[PDB]
Amino acid sequence: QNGADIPGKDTFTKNIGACRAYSAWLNIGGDSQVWTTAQFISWLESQGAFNHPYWMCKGSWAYANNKVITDTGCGNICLAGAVVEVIGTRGAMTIRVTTPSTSSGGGITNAQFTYINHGDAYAPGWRRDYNTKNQQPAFALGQTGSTVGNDKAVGWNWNSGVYNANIGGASTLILHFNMNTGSCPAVQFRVNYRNGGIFYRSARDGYGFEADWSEIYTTTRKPSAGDVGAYTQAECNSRFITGIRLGGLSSVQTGWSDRSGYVVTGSVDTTQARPIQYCINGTWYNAGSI
Amino acid sequence: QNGADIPGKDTFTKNIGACRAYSAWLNIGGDSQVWTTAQFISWLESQGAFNHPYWMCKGSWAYANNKVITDTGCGNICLAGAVVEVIGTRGAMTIRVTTPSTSSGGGITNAQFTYINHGDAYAPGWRRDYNTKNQQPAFALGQTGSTVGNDKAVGWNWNSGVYNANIGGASTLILHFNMNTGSCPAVQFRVNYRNGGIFYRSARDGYGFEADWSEIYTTTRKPSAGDVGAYTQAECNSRFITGIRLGGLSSVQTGWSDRSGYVVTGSVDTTQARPIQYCINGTWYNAGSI
Amino acid sequence: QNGADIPGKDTFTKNIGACRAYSAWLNIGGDSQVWTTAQFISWLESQGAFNHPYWMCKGSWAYANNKVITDTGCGNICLAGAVVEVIGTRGAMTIRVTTPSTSSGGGITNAQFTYINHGDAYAPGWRRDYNTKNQQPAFALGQTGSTVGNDKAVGWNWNSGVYNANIGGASTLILHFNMNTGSCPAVQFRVNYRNGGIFYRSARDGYGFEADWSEIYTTTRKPSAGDVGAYTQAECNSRFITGIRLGGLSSVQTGWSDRSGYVVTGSVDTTQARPIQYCINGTWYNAGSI
């Protein structure tokens, strides 16, 4: 007989205090219309879910038979092929809904939702797990994505992360931050191996990165004197005079005719003259005369 | 009759091998005193939880009736309105506790705790899920928080993240890292849109950021010659002499009286003289005489 | 009697629509051989798991009795002391497996796996939760690890994160990014408290950081004139001439003999001479003569 001769078997289960396995392939609703959680708890009422302390159920593997909930605040719930577990009372309600790897209507796949309703003053609502399929949106350890084809290939609106970029024969590190908002939504740093150089570029509105990398100056990548508007030492040394003097003496017995660069330095009879000389970078030169 | 005429219904359930729905609104404990997990498993013993392979339960929606556990090592568990599921033996024990959106005593809301006790040499203890309500403490993708009112508004002790800061008419990107410890617990970078400048500031002990932004020098924001203690080229060019010579000839038939800047260059009779001239930035000048 | 006088008690449970508590300490398999999920669902068939809408089970606390699954794509599942819950049909299958704090065969401890098999065209497979024991691999808020003993102690291949490093008497902030791949797999920034300096170093292949920190130049850490290859202003000022003139007059009644630095400037009788003088940094000097 094996209990097949039991009237009101659902009441029996309640009396014995056993968990209610309500259905393995039930169609939750008529069709895949959209339904609210108030309508979901109404449908649970009509099947007697709150008559049992634990009451489970599994939506049929048919998209055209099962509702979808749309007011969770943490993603849609497609009841097609969804496990529904109901714990508590109609007063103090706990539903745990486990979704499968495929859905319709925008349902979150590979998820466990949990619904509490302990009264309207006690914050009713839904929550969703994080898992290896539905990760938390967090900056990843390790490498984000796959290697991109050139150093500028990470788009301004990609996930923040550490990326590898091909530069031909080697590759370079791209450290990308993006917040999807603001006048500057993103910044990227390019880093070459073995302190080979570090650079940044930053975005603008929805226009991406309009400027080329700016290389950051460091003690292994110092500015040049021209970068800062100055001369190098060698450029100063080759232009400006450091000394003036009179050169070797010449004389004549009398007279001394004007000679390019020469000045009279003595009139003993005899006239003495020397060239004016000036020094640039250690080298002396004779002055000339117009 | 519907099994209402069954003595020892709990034993019946065990014999039939069905999961035990023990109560929908039980008060777990006398009051909201603090209790240990040893006391929690003792209370489970006294209700016969380990007599069944699966044994569930749901604490009453009354804070003044239900215990709270405090030794989890992953947050307090308020049993008020908590689902308690017990799986295994008193020897090899697994409890899954699902908490609702509100608690007392510091209970973690919106949580699923799991307790293993397979023997004291086999690492007994608690664990807690991560979910959309109780996220993992991880650097967020996208924007952290809301837009702040000025570029220095992200406090040194805020969560690491990418923030947007109003700068009046536009906004700027603030990249903030904080580890809550050490002589320098935090660093922030300010990044202006379209490579408009990148800056950092870093904190000290619990004192925050005592120095203003330091702008980082780059190939689009190069130091000036004055920044590095040097002259610009134009400043050198306007100060230092590049050439010396004698200017145009004057003569007199005899004599030549001392004249400011002039030197005698010939005594043919006739005396010849020229001015000393020097060159600065291409411009010649006559020397003077004291 | 208490149902002890029931033939085919498993069929009874199915007829009454109650969840099947199949065993509290069953050995799932013969030994700890490796098994596939096809073999796992076959073993579930032979115990009648899919005969019930909810069917639970708990592997015995004996490593030498229970299988381990190895094809999940999200870590091994050691059934020793594992809770197995089976929901749905053999057609539309949902298994939730909860593992304890210790395993063998490489099983993931402290985990909840979920398996869907709704048909081979509907993406069968496994997923695993994230929780306080098995966190998601994400850049951590706050401090990563413990304080390290010197500023270069964070290895190139450690988790990206914010670290604190002892520098003797104080400590410094190390911001580390590592993607485990590429010619430059990692970059670190060192940040000193109160804008005391910011530096980077970057790795190469598997060789780590071969170069010392490069300090980044900023408006509080400007390059020197020598860094950029230039002279300082004081170095220019002390080397190069800014003016030339003739000094005070000397005269003699006649004559004037050649005198170091002196040139004849007048022949009234009487000869007048002055020294050539040049100016460096405001100081005048007398020229000499070879």
Residue B214 to residue B217: CA distance in whole angstroms: 9
| Three-class DSSP category at C284 | strand
Positive or negative, the CA dihedral A172, A173, A178, A182 is: negative
Q: With b meaning 16 or more CB within 10 Å and e meaning fewer, what string describes C55-72? A: bbbbbbbebebbbbbeeb
Q: At what angle do helices B9-16 and C9-16 cross, to 10 degrees?
A: 110
Give the residue from chain C lying closest to A100, CA to CA: C116
- Cα dist from B25 to A12, A44, A53, B35, C227, whole Å: 20, 19, 8, 20, 77
For the range A2-11, what are the long-range contacts, defined as Cβ-Cβ under 8 Å and sequence gap of 24 or more? A2/C6, A2/C7, A2/C8, A2/C11, A2/C12, A2/C15, A3/C12, A3/C15, A3/C16, A4/C15, A6/B2, A6/C15, A6/C16, A7/B2, A8/B2, A9/C15, A9/C16, A9/C17, A10/A48, A10/A51, A10/C17, A11/B2
**Cβ-Cβ contacts under 8 Å, C173 against chain B:** 177, 179, 182, 184-187, 202
Element (H, E) at B39: helix B37-46
Residue B106 to residue B115: CA distance in whole angstroms: 19
Give the residue from chain B lying closest to A276, CA to CA: B245
In a mutagenesis test of the A interface, which of C5, C175, C290 is the best target, namely the one with the most A β-carbons within 10 Å? C290
Nearest to C182 by CA among A188, A139, A148: A148
User: Hey, what amino acid is at B233?
Assistant: Q
User: Hey, what amino acid is at B126?
Assistant: W
Positive or negative, the CA dihedral B251, B257, B258, B264 is: positive
Torsion of CA C188, C194, C195, C197, to 10 degrees: -50
Q: What is the resolution of this structure in A?
A: 2.0
Could you tell me if C220 and B202 are in contact, meaning their C-beta atoms sit under 8 angstroms apart?
A: no
Quickly count: other Cβ atoms within 10 Å of residue C167's Cβ.
Answer: 16
Residue B265 to residue A256: CA distance in whole angstroms: 8
Quickly count: other Cβ atoms within 10 Å of residue B45's Cβ.
Answer: 12
The partner residue sitting opposite A210, judged by closest CB among B144, B194, B224, is B194
- Cα A211–chain centre separation: 18
What are the strands, taking DSSP E only, across B59-157?
Answer: 68-69, 77-78, 83-88, 93-98, 112-117, 125-128
| Three-class DSSP category at C250 | strand
Torsion of CA C80, C81, C87, C91, to 10 degrees: 0
**Shortest distance, CA A151 to any CA of chain C (angstroms):** 13
Residue B80 to residue A153: CA distance in whole angstroms: 53
Quickly count: other Cβ atoms within 10 Å of residue C143's Cβ.
Answer: 18
Nearest to C98 by CA among A113, B115, A21: B115
Residue A276 to residue A274: CA distance in whole angstroms: 7
Strand order in the sheet with A93-98: A20-21, A54-58, A83-88, A93-98, A112-117, A125-128
For the range A37-45, what are the long-range contacts, defined as Cβ-Cβ under 8 Å and sequence gap of 24 or more? A37/A69, A37/A71, A37/A72, A37/A115, A37/A117, A37/A126, A39/A67, A40/A67, A40/A69, A40/A95, A41/A90, A41/A93, A41/A117, A43/A67, A44/A84, A44/A86, A44/A95, A45/A90
The partner residue sitting opposite A242, judged by closest CB among C16, C118, C241, is C241
Residue C1: partners with Cβ closer than 8 Å, 6 or more residues away: none
- The DSSP output letter for A43 is H
Q: How far apart are the first and last CA of chain A?
A: 135
Element (H, E) at B238: helix B233-239
Nearest to C44 by CA among C78, C119, C103, C95: C95
**Interchain CB distance below 8 Å, B258 and C240:** no
User: Which value, in Å, is the radius of gyration of the alpha carbons in chain A?
Assistant: 44
Could you tell me if C244 and A241 are in contact, meaning their C-beta atoms sit under 8 angstroms apart?
A: no
In a mutagenesis test of the A interface, which of C15, C54, C126 is the best target, namely the one with the most A β-carbons within 10 Å? C54
Residue A249 to residue C159: CA distance in whole angstroms: 79
Q: How far apart are the first and last CA of chain B?
A: 135
* DSSP β-ladder status, B198-202 and B186-191: antiparallel
Residue A230 to residue A211: CA distance in whole angstroms: 26
DSSP string computed for B198-228: EEEEE--TTS---S--EEBPBTTBPPPTTTT
**Cβ-Cβ contacts under 8 Å, B286 against chain A:** none
Q: Phi first, then psi: give them for residue A9, nearest 5 degrees.
A: -55, -30
| Three-class DSSP category at C150 | coil
In a mutagenesis test of the C interface, which of A12, A151, A191, A278 is the best target, namely the one with the most C β-carbons within 10 Å? A191
User: Hey, what amino acid is at A145?
Assistant: G
User: Hey, what amino acid is at B203?
Assistant: A
Return the bridge partners of C250, or none: C273
User: Hey, what amino acid is at B13?
Assistant: T
CA atoms within 13 A on the CB side of A270: 10
**Vertex A229, ends A223 and A233: CA angle to 5°?**
75
Residue C273 to residue A265: CA distance in whole angstroms: 8
Give the residue from chain C lying closest to A251, CA to CA: C258
| Three-class DSSP category at C124 | coil
DSSP string computed for A239-262: HSEEEEEE---EEEE------TTE
- The DSSP output letter for B50 is G
Residue C139 to residue A175: CA distance in whole angstroms: 13
Could you tell me if C17 and A20 are in contact, meaning their C-beta atoms sit under 8 angstroms apart?
A: yes
Q: C touches which chains (3+ CB pairs under 8 A)?
A: A, B
- Cα dist from A271 to A146, B109, C257, whole Å: 89, 111, 9
**Shortest distance, CA C70 to any CA of chain B (angstroms):** 23
* DSSP β-ladder status, B186-191 and B171-178: antiparallel
Nearest to B214 by CA among C192, C287, A9, C10: C192
**Interchain CB distance below 8 Å, A269 and C255:** yes
**Interchain CB distance below 8 Å, C136 and B137:** no
- Residue B182: both structure tokens together: 């050490």
Residue B168: partners with Cβ closer than 8 Å, 6 or more residues away: none
Could you tell me if C264 and A266 are in contact, meaning their C-beta atoms sit under 8 angstroms apart?
A: yes
The partner residue sitting opposite A225, judged by closest CB among C17, C228, C256, is C228
**Cβ-Cβ contacts under 8 Å, B258 against chain C:** 249, 265-266, 272, 274
**Interchain CB distance below 8 Å, B58 and A94:** yes
Residue A53 to residue B59: CA distance in whole angstroms: 11
* DSSP β-ladder status, A198-202 and A214-215: antiparallel
**Cβ-Cβ contacts under 8 Å, B142 against chain A:** 137, 160, 178-180
Could you tell me if C31 and C56 are in contact, meaning their C-beta atoms sit under 8 angstroms apart?
A: no
User: Hey, what amino acid is at C86?
Assistant: V
**Interchain CB distance below 8 Å, B16 and C22:** no
**Cβ-Cβ contacts under 8 Å, C192 against chain B:** 184, 202
**Cβ-Cβ contacts under 8 Å, B125 against chain C:** 101
| Three-state DSSP string of B16-28 | HCECEECCCCECC
**Interchain CB distance below 8 Å, C162 and B184:** no
Residue A67 to residue A269: CA distance in whole angstroms: 129
**Shortest distance, CA B198 to any CA of chain A (angstroms):** 8
**Shortest distance, CA A163 to any CA of chain B (angstroms):** 15
Strand order in the sheet with C214-215: C161-166, C171-178, C186-191, C198-202, C214-215
| Three-class DSSP category at A238 | helix
**Interchain CB distance below 8 Å, C87 and A247:** no
- Cα dist from B115 to A249, B40, B48, B95, C167, whole Å: 107, 11, 18, 5, 42
- Cα B278–chain centre separation: 62
Residue B129 to residue A233: CA distance in whole angstroms: 66
| Three-class DSSP category at B11 | helix
**Cβ-Cβ contacts under 8 Å, B168 against chain A:** none
Nearest to B82 by CA among B59, B110, B103: B59
Nearest to A174 by CA among A199, A203, A204: A199
User: Which value, in Å, is the radius of gyration of the alpha carbons in chain C?
Assistant: 44
**Interchain CB distance below 8 Å, C182 and A171:** yes
**Interchain CB distance below 8 Å, C195 and B216:** no
- Residue C116: both structure tokens together: 């869907």
**Cβ-Cβ contacts under 8 Å, A229 against chain B:** 224-225, 232-233
Q: At what angle do helices A9-16 and C9-16 cross, to 10 degrees?
A: 110
**Cβ-Cβ contacts under 8 Å, A242 against chain C:** 239-241
- Residue A229: both structure tokens together: 């508007």
**Interchain CB distance below 8 Å, B2 and A8:** yes
Nearest to B216 by CA among A227, A200, A161: A200
Nearest to C135 by CA among C147, C144, C125: C144
- Residue C209: both structure tokens together: 């950081």
Break chain C down into helix, strand, coil percent, rounded to 5.
10, 35, 55
Could you tell me if C98 and C129 are in contact, meaning their C-beta atoms sit under 8 angstroms apart?
A: no
**Interchain CB distance below 8 Å, C267 and B267:** yes
For the range A149-152, what are the long-range contacts, defined as Cβ-Cβ under 8 Å and sequence gap of 24 or more? A151/A190, A151/A213, A152/A209
**Shortest distance, CA B142 to any CA of chain C (angstroms):** 14
Residue B88: partners with Cβ closer than 8 Å, 6 or more residues away: B50, B53, B94, C24, C25, C58, C81, C83
What are the strands, taking DSSP E only, across C129-197?
Answer: 161-166, 171-178, 186-191
**Cβ-Cβ contacts under 8 Å, C119 against chain A:** 61
Q: Which technique was the structure solved with, according to the deposited record?
A: X-ray
Return the bridge partners of A13, or none: none
Which residue in this structure is represented by tokens 């022949």?
C267
Q: With b meaning 16 or more CB within 10 Å and e meaning fewer, what string describes A150-161? A: ebbebebebbbb
Burial class (CB in 10 A: 0-12, 13-18, 19+), C146: exposed
Q: Phi first, then psi: give them for residue B234, nearest 5 degrees.
A: -65, -35
Nearest to C173 by CA among C155, C139, C202, C198: C198
Q: Phi first, then psi: give them for residue A153, nearest 5 degrees.
A: -85, -15
Which residue in this structure is represented by tokens 């800056």?
B199
- The DSSP output letter for C119 is -
- Residue A13: both structure tokens together: 């289960």
- Residue B114: both structure tokens together: 């799991």
Give the count of Cβ contacts less than 8 A between chain A and B: 310
| Three-class DSSP category at C224 | coil
- Cα dist from A34 to A77, C171, C191, whole Å: 10, 58, 54
**Shortest distance, CA B30 to any CA of chain C (angstroms):** 29
Q: Phi first, then psi: give them for residue A28, nearest 5 degrees.
A: -80, 95
Residue A227: partners with Cβ closer than 8 Å, 6 or more residues away: B219, B222, B223, C228
- Residue B88: both structure tokens together: 């295994």
What are the start-end ranges of the H helices in chain A? 9-16, 37-46, 233-239
- Residue C272: both structure tokens together: 């007048």
Dmax (CA) of chain C: 157
**Vertex C262, ends C261 and C267: CA angle to 5°?**
165
Q: A touches which chains (3+ CB pairs under 8 A)?
A: B, C
User: Hey, what amino acid is at B136?
Assistant: Q
Give the residue from chain C lying closest to B266, CA to CA: C264
CA atoms within 13 A on the CB side of B180: 10
- The DSSP output letter for B130 is -
Nearest to C131 by CA among C108, C111, C145: C111
- Cα dist from A256 to A8, A261, C283, whole Å: 144, 13, 34
In a mutagenesis test of the A interface, which of B47, B96, B192, B218 is the best target, namely the one with the most A β-carbons within 10 Å? B218
Residue B279 to residue B259: CA distance in whole angstroms: 20
Could you tell me if B18 and A19 are in contact, meaning their C-beta atoms sit under 8 angstroms apart?
A: yes
Quickly count: other Cβ atoms within 10 Å of residue B43's Cβ.
Answer: 16
**Shortest distance, CA C69 to any CA of chain A (angstroms):** 17
**Interchain CB distance below 8 Å, B131 and A122:** no
CA atoms within 13 A on the CB side of B174: 31
Nearest to A200 by CA among B217, B260, B114: B217
Could you tell me if C136 and B138 are in contact, meaning their C-beta atoms sit under 8 angstroms apart?
A: yes
